[PDB]
């Protein structure tokens, strides 16, 4: 009855979506050729008799990764024209992705979204995958979000952004692109989850003892997190939460809507046998500083709202005992105006492990989403970098020649200053 | 979808282009006959960037050849891999430049540009949409420099929104090759600084040293140096032909590297470079490549990076490797050598990864840097120009074709302004 | 006599090399099929493929890949013949070898399964209507050969 539409933009979005869709197929038992040898209607449609097609859209200006997906194994699954490409990419240029190249393809993307929404009856909302530091993943994502907000508005919108790391960073104009896209999407987004690459590298190394991790492993972890998020809609449990109540429980202020995700427990087969994974133990482990997936130290901030999504063989009495112990713990401190800050959801479907992966099979899992004030330090560092580059007016001529004025840079700087001031005021 | 057209001019340009086409045709598994003899379907998925189909399974390179004498054209036509070039793409004159910039740029260029432009326009319109241009020439030549400058001006006048990549050689610091090297070098630089987008500088002393020491080849012939330059070219352009983990095309590199419109001179590098014998006693891994790229002896431009500060560094990796190792190596090299990087710009390193290693190896990388050490080259060129121009030596060969002292003064002023800019951005 | 294993290994190596160029093989098949019309009946025999070769189809690479496929077929036939030379379950497995490698034999409905994913790389229409059997012929023969060797030893 309830349906969700996923949109993947850019290389990172396309690859993460590919991983999560193969995980979805494995969980639901649908063969890669589309033939299944009654609860999959949320993500999979029906084509006449015996064929199931996913409800997703893949968008990228460059045709390389989309062509690889079309040629790959999952070609008898995706609709032939649900995959949209172009000729030239944005190439780390927000102006190119926002003004010049995307305006001849946003119309087609919107037409396909409308056609997909026509099929559904109980549409819930959209999930958008992109990256802040990429030209297309910033500009085209902002354009698509503004067009969707204009067209529909009422339906909720959620994002899974890859937050650039403070130290391990790839491109050079990432602060410019991130500042511009944040200033554009602050007024249109509803709740944007945050993950990072260096944090996941550290988690993978320290826990699974893998010397040479890779993007495939990172995308598998992200797909596990997304599946844990959507399990409440996909299956039925003792206490399930939908996509509408997430924003209400996690967003206390109109512009403070930047939570972060956490997953536990993550271990390998060698440590799986010599360990007793209990509800209290995993709940305690989910709070340690060296387990979250955003590179920041939680003792520099205070928690505001925490969402717990237990998954598998879970007992409410020991869940409540673990929550009470965590509340009694003195090292973790909360904000004064939030007497109650816990949302608990339980599902009866144990996590599913992809064969040949680096994740051992378990019985319980905890996915945690936290809204905290520690993001102020990250925003401070990012705008300090922006100011340092913009003092000399470097790399500005590309944006100027593509159709942008320095007024946009000034306005974005002012908006980020205002947001940092809002965080500083709210923290006390 | 992304078509690249290649332009050649002069003796050095023609020879380097022949070697480059040989290497590229080897990469895609195309025999000198003209028929596909590959082994995987990945090789012909993107054969449209550099080749055109014709009749039954015959691929012809999309190249234009320009010269004033039929000598090197006949030599390359009678040599190996000479039966794949289109016979209609050989354009040549009859007189010759004779190491004169004025003759190439004012006298015979006028009668050659019409035909070469007609051919280039036909090749450009043959496709659906272009991506950019490439050019291999010599700054210090007589016909290559003038003809390439005139062509660059014409194309930039006609196609004003496409990238232009030039792979030009530069005068050697120790021993020159022509007496009038600084005049042509200065005029070519003055035109290139304004009519291009990114220029890669290559020397000959660096290639001589590399071929003498790394491969212990006691007979360094131009074939080997041209092969090295072609390998660098392929390493630069490989991302537009094969899938990878983190793609990065030419426009992406241009956006990420050049911060100011006039600071667009790069100097490349390559890795690994090991001998035939000592190859057995070395472990080929990512740390070895990271150690090898950041060295003065492994670069193809005769300059010392220790004398200047790096602005932006772009490294393109090929083969199967982990992103974590690359990230840790780049962070380590940026953190332990903070004295060699500018501070007002953070994250001086851009990384790209492909998945098809070069034939005969397992993993390789290409280094491209934009440093402040080009000021030494430009300062030496300007000093030589002033020293010769004070006595008006060899100048009567230029005024006899249409030149004037004003052009020389303006070119010297432009060099002084550019070197002052590089000095003051330090 | 524990001596045809080398021939089997060479055959499977060449089959792997051909499986890499499967896509070009399908393109050549489609081009020659369009050139020779008869587009209402899917491929049913190897002799039909040989006739499509003999018909003017050109394009060089098409002839190369089709010649490679026919060479694999000929070597498989030779192996079916020689396994009896080197000497009930083995008998009817060899009978299946002979009857499948025989040129005059319907192969439109032939299919392969796990671990062979050759049919997953085809588009829906071609997989269910045109080229289901041709790409699924060699792996079945190789599996039969390995099973027969397993019974023999």
């Amino acid at each position: 009855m309830r349906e969700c539409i996923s949109i993947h933009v850019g290389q990172a979005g396309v690859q993460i979506g590919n991983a999560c869709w193969e995980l979805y197929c494995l969980e639901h038992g649908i063969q890669p050729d589309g033939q299944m040898p009654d609860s999959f209607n949320t993500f999979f449609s029906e084509t006449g008799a015996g064929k199931h097609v996913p409800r997703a859209v893949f968008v990228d200006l460059e045709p390389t990764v989309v062509d690889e997906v079309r040629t790959g194994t999952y070609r008898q699954l995706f609709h032939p024209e649900q995959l949209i490409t172009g000729k030239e990419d944005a190439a780390n240029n927000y102006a190119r992705g926002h003004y010049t190249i995307g305006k001849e393809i946003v119309d087609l993307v919107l037409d396909r979204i409308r056609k997909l929404a026509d099929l559904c009856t109980g549409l819930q909302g959209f999930l958008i995958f992109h990256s802040f530091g990429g030209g297309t993943g910033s500009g085209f994502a902002s354009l698509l979000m503004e067009r969707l907000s204009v067209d529909y508005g009422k339906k909720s919108k959620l994002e899974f952004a890859i937050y650039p790391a403070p130290q391990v960073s790839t491109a050079v104009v990432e602060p410019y692109n991130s500042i511009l896209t944040t200033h554009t999407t602050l007024e249109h987004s509803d709740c944007a989850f945050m993950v990072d690459n260096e944090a996941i590298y550290d988690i993978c190394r320290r826990n699974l003892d893998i010397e040479r991790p890779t993007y495939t492993n990172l995308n598998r972890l992200i797909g596990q997190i997304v599946s844990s998020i959507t399990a409440s809609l996909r299956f039925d449990g003792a206490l399930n939460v939908d996509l509408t109540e997430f924003q209400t429980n996690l967003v206390p202020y109109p512009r403070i809507h930047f939570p972060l995700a956490t997953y536990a427990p993550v271990i390998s087969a060698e440590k799986a046998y010599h360990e007793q994974l209990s509800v209290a133990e995993i709940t305690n482990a989910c709070f340690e500083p060296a387990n979250q997936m955003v590179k920041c130290d939680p003792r520099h901030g205070k928690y505001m709202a925490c969402c717990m999504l237990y998954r598998g063989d879970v007992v409410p009495k020991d869940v409540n005992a673990a929550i009470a112990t965590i509340k009694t713990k003195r090292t973790i401190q909360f904000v004064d105006w939030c007497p109650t800050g816990f949302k608990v959801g339980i599902n009866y479907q144990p996590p599913t492990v992809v064969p040949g992966g680096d994740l051992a099979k378990v019985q319980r899992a905890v996915c945690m989403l936290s809204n905290t004030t520690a993001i102020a330090e990250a925003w401070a560092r990012l705008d300090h970098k922006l100011d340092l580059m913009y003092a000399k007016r470097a790399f500005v001529h590309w944006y100027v020649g593509e159709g942008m004025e320095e007024g946009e840079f000034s306005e974005a700087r002012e908006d980020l200053a205002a947001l940092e001031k809002d965080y500083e005021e709210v923290g006390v | 979808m992304r078509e690249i057209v290649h332009l050649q001019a002069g003796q050095c340009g023609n020879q380097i282009g022949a070697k480059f086409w040989e290497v590229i045709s080897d990469e895609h598994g195309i025999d000198p006959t003209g028929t596909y003899h590959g082994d995987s379907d990945l090789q012909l998925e993107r054969i449209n960037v550099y080749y055109n189909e014709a009749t039954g399974g015959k691929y012809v390179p999309r190249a234009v050849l320009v010269d004033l004498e039929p000598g090197t054209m006949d030599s390359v036509r009678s040599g190996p891999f000479g039966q794949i070039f289109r016979p209609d793409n050989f354009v040549f004159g009859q007189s010759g430049a004779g190491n004169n910039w004025a003759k190439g740029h004012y006298t015979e260029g006028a009668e050659l540009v019409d035909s070469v432009l007609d051919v280039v326009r036909k090749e450009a319109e043959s496709c659906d949409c272009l991506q950019g241009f490439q050019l291999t020439h010599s700054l210090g030549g007589g016909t290559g420099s003038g003809m390439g400058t005139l062509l660059i001006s014409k194309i930039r006048e006609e196609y004003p929104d496409r990238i232009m990549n030039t792979f030009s050689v530069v005068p050697s610091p120790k021993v020159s090759d022509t007496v009038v090297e600084p005049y042509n070098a200065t005029l070519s630089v003055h035109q290139l600084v304004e009519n291009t987008d990114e220029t890669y500088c290559i020397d000959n002393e660096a290639l001589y040293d590399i071929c003498f020491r790394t491969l212990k080849l006691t007979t360094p012939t131009y074939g080997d140096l041209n092969h090295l330059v072609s390998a660098t070219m392929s390493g630069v352009t490989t991302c537009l032909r094969f899938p990878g983990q983190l793609n990065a095309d030419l426009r992406k590199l241009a956006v990420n590297m050049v911060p100011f419109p006039r600071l667009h001179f790069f100097m490349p590098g390559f890795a690994p470079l090991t001998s035939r014998g000592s190859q057995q006693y070395r472990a080929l891994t990512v740390p070895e490549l990271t150690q090898q790229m950041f060295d003065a002896k492994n670069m193809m431009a005769a300059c010392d990076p220790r004398h200047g500060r790096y602005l932006t560094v772009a490294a393109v990796f090929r083969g199967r490797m982990s992103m974590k190792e690359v990230d840790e190596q780049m962070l380590n090299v940026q953190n332990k050598n903070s004295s060699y990087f500018v501070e007002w710009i953070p994250n001086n390193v851009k990384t790209a990864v492909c998945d098809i290693p070069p034939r005969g190896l397992k993993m390789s990388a290409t280094f491209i840097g934009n440093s402040t050490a080009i000021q030494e080259l430009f300062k030496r060129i300007s000093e030589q120009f002033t020293a010769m121009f004070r006595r008006k030596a060899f100048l009567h060969w230029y005024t006899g074709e249409g030149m004037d002292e004003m052009e020389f003064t303006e070119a010297e002023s432009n060099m002084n302004d550019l070197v002052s800019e590089y000095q003051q951005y330090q | 006599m524990n001596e045809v294993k080398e021939s089997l290994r060479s055959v499977e190596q060449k089959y792997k090399i051909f499986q890499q160029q499967q896509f070009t093989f399908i393109g050549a098949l489609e081009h020659c099929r369009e050139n020779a019309h008869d587009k209402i009946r899917p491929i049913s025999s190897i002799g039909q493929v040989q006739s499509y070769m003999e018909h003017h189809c050109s394009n060089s690479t098409d002839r190369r890949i089709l010649l490679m496929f026919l060479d694999i077929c000929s070597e498989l036939s030779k192996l079916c013949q020689h396994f009896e030379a080197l000497h009930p379950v083995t008998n009817n497995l060899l009978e299946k070898c002979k009857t499948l490698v025989s040129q005059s034999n319907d192969l439109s409905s032939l299919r392969a399964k796990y671990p062979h994913d050759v049919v997953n790389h085809l588009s829906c229409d071609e997989a269910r209507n045109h080229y289901g059997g041709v790409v699924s012929l060699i792996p079945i023969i190789l599996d039969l050969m390995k099973e027969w060797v397993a019974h023999s030893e």
């Binding site: 494995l26 194994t73 | 082994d39 998945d355 005969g360 | -």
Partner: peptide, 20 residues
């Protein structure tokens, strides 16, 4: 020199068996 090069995508997303 033989060519034994294949992309990381094809060697990772192999057709896994369907669970019961």
């Amino acid at each position: 020199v033989p060519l034994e090069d294949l992309t990381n995508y094809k060697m990772s997303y192999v057709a896994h068996p369907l669970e019961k």
